[PDB]
Amino acid sequence: ADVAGTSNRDFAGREQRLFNSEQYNYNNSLNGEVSVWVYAYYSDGSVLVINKNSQYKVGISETFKALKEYREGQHNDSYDEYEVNQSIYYPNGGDARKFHSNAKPRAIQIIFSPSVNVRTIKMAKGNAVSVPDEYLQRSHPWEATGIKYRKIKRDGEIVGYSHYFELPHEYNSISLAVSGVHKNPSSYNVGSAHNVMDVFQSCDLALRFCNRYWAELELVNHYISPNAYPYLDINNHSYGVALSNRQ
Amino acid sequence: ADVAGTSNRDFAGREQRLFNSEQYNYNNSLNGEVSVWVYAYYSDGSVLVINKNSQYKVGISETFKALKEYREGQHNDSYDEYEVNQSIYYPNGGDARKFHSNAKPRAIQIIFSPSVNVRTIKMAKGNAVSVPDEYLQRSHPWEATGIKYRKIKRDGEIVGYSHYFELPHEYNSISLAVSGVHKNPSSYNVGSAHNVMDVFQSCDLALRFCNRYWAELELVNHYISPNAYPYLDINNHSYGVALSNRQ
Amino acid sequence: INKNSQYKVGISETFKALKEYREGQHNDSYDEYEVNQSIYYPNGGDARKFHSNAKPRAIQIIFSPSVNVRTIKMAKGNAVSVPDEYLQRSHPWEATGIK
Amino acid sequence: ADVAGTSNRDFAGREQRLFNSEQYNYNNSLNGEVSVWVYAYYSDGSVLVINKNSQYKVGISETFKALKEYREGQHNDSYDEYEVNQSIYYPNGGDARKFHSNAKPRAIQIIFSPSVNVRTIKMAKGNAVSVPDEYLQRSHPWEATGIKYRKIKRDGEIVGYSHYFELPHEYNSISLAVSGVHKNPSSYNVGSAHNVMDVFQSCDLALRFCNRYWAELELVNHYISPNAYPYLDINNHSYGVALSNRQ
Numbered sequence: 032a033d034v035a036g037t038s039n040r041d042f043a044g045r046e047q048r049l050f051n052s053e054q055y056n057y058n059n060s061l062n063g064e065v066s067v068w069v070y071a072y073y074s075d076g077s078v079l080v081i082n083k084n085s086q087y088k089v090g091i092s093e094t095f096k097a098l099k100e101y102r103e104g105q106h107n108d109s110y111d112e113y114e115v116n117q118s119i120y121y122p123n124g125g126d127a128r129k130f131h132s133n134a135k136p137r138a139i140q141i142i143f144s145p146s147v148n149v150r151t152i153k154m155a156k157g158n159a160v161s162v163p164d165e166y167l168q169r170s171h172p173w174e175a176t177g178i179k180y181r182k183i184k185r186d187g188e189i190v191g192y193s194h195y196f197e198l199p200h201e202y203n204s205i206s207l208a209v210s211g212v213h214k215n216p217s218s219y220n221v222g223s224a225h226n227v228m229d230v231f232q233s234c235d236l237a238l239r240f241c242n243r244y245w246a247e248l249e250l251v252n253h254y255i256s257p258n259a260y261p262y263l264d265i266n267n268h269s270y271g272v273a274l275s276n277r278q
Numbered sequence: 279a280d281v282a283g284t285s286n287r288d289f290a291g292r293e294q295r296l297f298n299s300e301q302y303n304y305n306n307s308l309n310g311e312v313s314v315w316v317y318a319y320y321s322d323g324s325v326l327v328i329n330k331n332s333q334y335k336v337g338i339s340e341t342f343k344a345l346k347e348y349r350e351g352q353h354n355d356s357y358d359e360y361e362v363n364q365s366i367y368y369p370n371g372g373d374a375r376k377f378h379s380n381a382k383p384r385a386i387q388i389i390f391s392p393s394v395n396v397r398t399i400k401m402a403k404g405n406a407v408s409v410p411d412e413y414l415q416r417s418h419p420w421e422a423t424g425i426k427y428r429k430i431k432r433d434g435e436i437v438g439y440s441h442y443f444e445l446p447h448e449y450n451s452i453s454l455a456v457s458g459v460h461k462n463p464s465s466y467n468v469g470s471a472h473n474v475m476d477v478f479q480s481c482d483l484a485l486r487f488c489n490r491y492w493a494e495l496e497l498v499n500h501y502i503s504p505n506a507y508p509y510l511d512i513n514n515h516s517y518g519v520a521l522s523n524r525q
Numbered sequence: 526i527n528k529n530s531q532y533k534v535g536i537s538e539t540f541k542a543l544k545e546y547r548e549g550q551h552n553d554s555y556d557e558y559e560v561n562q563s564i565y566y567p568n569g570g571d572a573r574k575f576h577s578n579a580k581p582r583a584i585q586i587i588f589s590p591s592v593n594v595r596t597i598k599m600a601k602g603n604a605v606s607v608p609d610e611y612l613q614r615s616h617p618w619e620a621t622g623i624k
Numbered sequence: 625a626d627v628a629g630t631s632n633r634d635f636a637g638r639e640q641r642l643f644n645s646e647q648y649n650y651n652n653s654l655n656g657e658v659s660v661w662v663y664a665y666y667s668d669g670s671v672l673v674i675n676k677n678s679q680y681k682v683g684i685s686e687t688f689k690a691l692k693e694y695r696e697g698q699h700n701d702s703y704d705e706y707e708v709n710q711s712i713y714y715p716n717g718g719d720a721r722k723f724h725s726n727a728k729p730r731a732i733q734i735i736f737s738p739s740v741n742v743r744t745i746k747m748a749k750g751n752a753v754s755v756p757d758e759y760l761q762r763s764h765p766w767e768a769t770g771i772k773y774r775k776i777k778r779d780g781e782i783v784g785y786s787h788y789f790e791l792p793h794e795y796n797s798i799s800l801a802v803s804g805v806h807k808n809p810s811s812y813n814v815g816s817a818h819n820v821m822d823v824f825q826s827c828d829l830a831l832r833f834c835n836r837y838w839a840e841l842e843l844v845n846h847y848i849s850p851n852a853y854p855y856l857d858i859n860n861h862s863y864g865v866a867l868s869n870r871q
């Protein structure tokens with residue numbers, strides 16, 4: 032017969048806090064998801080998002096061509112854009128009718144879920160023919176870029192990790208792959224013989240999503256926010272939901 | 279104060295040789311790339327290339343449909359070619375307006391980087407419905423075809439490995455997957471528990487490339503040569519760059 | 526755009542006229558009408574894009590060395606061709622020669 | 625320490641009134657704009673507006689063809705409408721598939737800013753081949769129509785001047801030019817030798833605007849009102865902002 036918010040017998044309050052805490056902790060458990068998003072920003076203000084969600088580890092790999100703006104059900108200068116690709120793969124190799132394709136991304140943001148271990152993040156940012164570092168012979172196949180990731184924070188809680196980089200120059204023509212491993216502070220190796228086949232199955236079970244939104248507003252409103260995803264906008268504003276020990 | 283090319287004090291010469299040797303050896307190290315290319319040759323003289331570059335191991339897998347010629351931004355007889363597929367998947371199963379689709383590859387060449395171990399190469403050359411050997415029940419899922427690979431050589435150095443096969447007959451309608459493992463003469467298993475999650479990450483981090491060139495000339499000039507890739511042309515001519523102990 | 530004349534010379538263009546037009550190619554003409562409506566008044570259009578890549582990213586004005594730079598005048602208006610927010614408070618030009 | 629709206633020490637009030645008065649008076653000064661709009665009303669309810677804003681004097685001149693409805697990015701019966709023009713320029717001179725083109729304006733409204741001197745307004749309302757009065761040989765090139773202009777009033781202030789005329793008959797096929805001169809109650813002639821080159825420059829510097837709105841509602845809401853322009857609607861309702869000595 033106690034009054035709300037006045038004693039330790041407010042079970043609605045306690046259960047609300049536990050409900051949120053359990054979600055925070057489940058995601059961070061070995062049973063939980065790790066997620067990555069790649070955002071490609073185009074000059075027309077639209078944004079391509081690619082997302083993958085999987086247990087244990089997760090990544091995305093795209094070609095130069097795949098990262099170019101594609102407007103579903105509209106004209107895309109498809110023939111001229113084939114010629115653009117040829118001239119990007121080798122200088123003067125194409126016969127395009129344009130100096131700069133507005134379909135090329137102007138910037139990339141990579142975001143991981145807070146369940147990633149940031150020291151496991153690896154990126155292969157290749158040239159337009161998918162070579163990590165000038166020539167295959169001298170290429171390490173990735174860079175460990177975790178130190179560059181900024182914490183996306185809401186109410187003091189890390190809700191995600193962001194690496195943002197611009198591609199403002201004519202020569203910024205890239206292929207891109209990124210990968211991170213789910214946190215595991217235990218000494219149980221999820222890829223040790225006991226569980227390695229489950230990790231192989233996780234590669235099959237990973238769910239992917241891709242869509243082009245017309246505006247960052249639409250991305251924030253209809254993609255980030257409804258799904259309780261983390262995001263950092265072009266104005267450096269953080270989005271996400273803090274859950275640990277919170278009502 | 280020594281004269282160029284006349285003593286052991288030609289440091290420009292020594293460093294040039296070391297620079298090239300280091301690239302050769304880095305590629306062959308466990309830190310290095312292994313690469314595969316699949317070339318599909320069409321009757322119009324164009325060539326589809328698919329390339330993947332990754333640490334540890336690498337492969338490509340394509341469907342029958344995926345290997346058919348696609349001309350970006352041009353007509354492709356898309357409806358008739360759906361009917362072609364139906365008649366290829368089962369005899370008399372389609373209603374195509376042609377006896378032979380000129381979109382079917384006439385030949386395939388598989389090339390691996392010299393950092394592959396040739397004894398690890400495996401190929402699954404399936405029928406048009408993606409069965410390795412007539413029926414699933416009697417199929418081994420691959421053949422180890424390394425003994426068939428020819429050494430692509432420049433100046434006495436192996437710059438790559440090639441398996442070329444023609445598809446000259448109406449019945450040569452294939453699905454195709456190929457895989458090789460990076461050399462590892464050490465007794466350190468890159469997939470042992472210590473490193474297995476890095477191999478899982480390598481699957482995410484692998485970069486892919488695909489493009490159709492109008493001619494083998496254009497492939498040699500604008501794809502093989504600029505990237506210091508190995509190649510064997512239809513005239514049996516070898517392309518590539520020898521690097522070990524060379525200026 | 527170039528004009529050559531004796532005594533004095535100038536050029537005057539609308540917002541629409543300065544947008545990229547690709548002769549003999551597709552130009553998203555309908556969507557670009559909607560772009561214009563949304564540029565003339567906020568939320569006034571129904572365009573399928575946030576930013577039209579047809580909008581100029583920069584302008585350079587060049588005069589021949591036979592101009593008197595102290596006579597140069599520019600009317601850089603908004604998208605509805607008003608020099609300075611509202612007609613009632615607009616001087617119809619700025620003397621920009623010092624720049 | 626006085627209370628708002630209770631003394632001569634309400635400086636916010638005084639400055640608000642001066643701010644508005646200054647805008648009213650600046651526009652009417654020789655440094656200010658004079659503006660003209662031509663509205664062409666089509667049977668589908670859409671309205672073409674042409675506006676020009678310039679110092680000293682201002683006008684608009686359009687051909688018969690230019691005043692016809694054009695729907696950007698939609699079909700316009702362009703070939704048939706060429707034939708319509710031929711049959712309008714000379715009776716039975718075309719081969720059109722229609723008796724009356726719905727692209728012809730049904731009415732015209734000319735509006736000047738209140739900074740015009742109404743006695744300077746001149747109109748050349750020509751026939752479809754751009755002759756003011758039947759034949760060039762007997763044409764005065766304009767009519768001084770200022771006496772016909774109605775004052776558009778808001779709160780007792782003239783906010784603009786309107787001349788409205790319908791074109792309800794099949795034979796109302798017009799070319800149209802209008803011109804007015806900015807008020808100048810001084811004895812300083814803005815076109816006297818001292819300033820004549822500035823008037824020549826004003827011809828270059830005049831800004832033009834044209835757009836077709838789908839409805840008079842849209843014109844009122846999104847063109848007239850946001851820009852503090854004067855307007856008189858088909859219901860004889862006046863729009864505009866009174867500024868002289870007003871808060």
Ligand SMILES: Nc1ncnc2c1ncn2[C@@H]1O[C@H](COP(=O)(O)OP(=O)(O)OP(=O)(O)O)[C@@H](O)[C@H]1O
Pocket residue numbers: 145182187188189
């Ligand atoms: N890897 C992690 N994952 C999730 N939460 C963490 C992690 N590391 C620390 N935290 C918790 O998140 C909160 C924020 O810690 P953090 O160190 O990020 O804050 P800070 O020191 O103010 O900012 P910064 O470290 O970026 O300068 C702390 O309450 C901490 O306990």
Ligand SMILES: Nc1ncnc2c1ncn2[C@@H]1O[C@H](COP(=O)(O)OP(=O)(O)OP(=O)(O)O)[C@@H](O)[C@H]1O
Pocket residue numbers: 392429434435436
């Ligand atoms: N697996 C390998 N990878 C890279 N280089 C190798 C490999 N095996 C041998 N080599 C080196 O490459 C060079 C060529 O050796 P190879 O045995 O291919 O020549 P060959 O005997 O003339 O030709 P083949 O063996 O094809 O008849 C030698 O100098 C050798 O040391």
Ligand SMILES: Nc1ncnc2c1ncn2[C@@H]1O[C@H](COP(=O)(O)OP(=O)(O)OP(=O)(O)O)[C@@H](O)[C@H]1O
Pocket residue numbers: 738775780781782
């Ligand atoms: N040419 C003008 N430009 C701007 N304001 C004017 C002009 N002539 C008069 N006014 C002012 O505008 C207000 C309206 O004057 P106006 O003579 O138009 O009113 P009215 O006599 O009620 O109407 P009308 O003259 O149309 O019958 C007056 O306060 C007057 O001082």
Ligand SMILES: Nc1ccn([C@@H]2O[C@H](COP(=O)(O)OP(=O)(O)OP(=O)(O)O)[C@@H](O)[C@H]2O)c(=O)n1
Pocket residue numbers: 105106107108109110111112114126127128351551
């Ligand atoms: N560098 C070149 C050379 C030729 N063309 C020709 O011009 C036409 C333009 O078409 P395309 O580039 O395909 O643009 P759209 O057809 O407008 O767009 P989409 O194909 O995406 O519908 C093509 O058919 C092609 O034959 C071209 O666009 N660019």
Ligand SMILES: Nc1ccn([C@@H]2O[C@H](COP(=O)(O)OP(=O)(O)OP(=O)(O)O)[C@@H](O)[C@H]2O)c(=O)n1
Pocket residue numbers: 352353354355356357358359361373374375
């Ligand atoms: N076996 C058949 C049966 C019918 N058609 C019809 O003929 C048309 C030919 O078009 P398609 O095969 O699609 O070739 P294109 O339109 O020229 O090429 P693309 O679709 O690649 O632009 C099709 O619309 C289809 O309705 C056909 O091509 N083949």
Ligand SMILES: Nc1ccn([C@@H]2O[C@H](COP(=O)(O)OP(=O)(O)OP(=O)(O)O)[C@@H](O)[C@H]2O)c(=O)n1
Pocket residue numbers: 106550551552553554555556557559571572573697
């Ligand atoms: N905001 C909107 C609403 C509708 N549409 C419709 O989608 C089609 C796209 O055509 P358009 O914008 O005119 O582009 P293109 O036809 O490709 O280019 P152009 O007209 O310059 O040849 C139009 O017919 C129009 O009916 C559109 O583009 N944009």
Ligand SMILES: Nc1ccn([C@@H]2O[C@H](COP(=O)(O)OP(=O)(O)OP(=O)(O)O)[C@@H](O)[C@H]2O)c(=O)n1
Pocket residue numbers: 698699700701702703704705707719720721
């Ligand atoms: N008096 C005539 C004679 C012939 N045609 C023919 O019929 C077609 C109708 O097209 P048009 O009048 O141009 O109308 P749309 O093509 O529908 O509109 P737009 O051209 O503005 O897209 C034309 O190609 C023209 O050859 C016509 O319209 N009117």
